Amino acid sequence: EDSLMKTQAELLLERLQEVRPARFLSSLWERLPQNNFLKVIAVALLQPGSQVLVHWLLGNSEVFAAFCRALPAGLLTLVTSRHPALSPVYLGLLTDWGQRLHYDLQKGIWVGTESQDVPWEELHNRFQSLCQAPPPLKDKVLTALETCKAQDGDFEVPGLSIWTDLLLALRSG
Numbered sequence: 001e002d003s004l005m006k007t008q009a010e011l012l013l014e015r016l017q018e019v020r021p022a023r024f025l026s027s028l029w030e031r032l033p034q035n036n037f038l039k040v041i042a043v044a045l046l047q048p049g050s051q052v053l054v055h056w057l058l059g060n061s062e063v064f065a066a067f068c069r070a071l072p073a074g075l076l077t078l079v080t081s082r083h084p085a086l087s088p089v090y091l092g093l094l095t096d097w098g099q100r101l102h103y104d105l106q107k108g109i110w111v112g113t114e115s116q117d118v119p120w121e122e123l124h125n126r127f128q129s130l131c132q133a134p135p136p137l138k139d140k141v142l143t144a145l146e147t148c149k150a151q152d153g154d155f156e157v158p159g160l161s162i163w164t165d166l167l168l169a170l171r172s173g
């Protein structure tokens with residue numbers, strides 16, 4: 001199941017620490033259904049190069065952007081804890097995605113305008129998960145959120161700044 005997926009992740013890593021191998025990954029990405037393949041890469045990133053997988057993910061910003069949308073918050077925080085080069089990249093997508101949103105006064109939420117825009121609940125959930133991560137990570141996340149809030153003007157009233165609002169949801173008194 002996830003035993004199929006462990007096996008497949010082992011086989012992909014064994015084939016990469018051996019063997020292209022950026023060219024292998026690119027042909028696998030064009031050939032395999034993307035859903036399957038993102039999950040296998042996720043498992044490959046968590047196995048006891050690999051640094052070859054990471055480099056290739058840094059090199060393919062579209063592929064990693066989909067990885068970051070498709071996979072659960074908690075999985076993303078695991079992957080990004082182990083592989084810190086993926087960290088500023090995750091945070092940058094998150095920041096970009098959050099900037100796309102605006103405040104719908106009638107619904108009382110932050111909403112996008114394009115199909116691909118990330119929902120508020122998803123952004124909230126990704127940051128909540130990142131904010132419960134082991135030290136080097138929790139602090140880079142916190143700083144990023146504060147940096148953006150300060151950039152918007154350090155507002156505390158709701159509906160101005162997504163970052164004000166996210167930090168209010170994320171902090172508990």
Ligand SMILES: [Hg+2]
Pocket residue numbers: 095144145146147148163
């Ligand atoms: Hg931010």
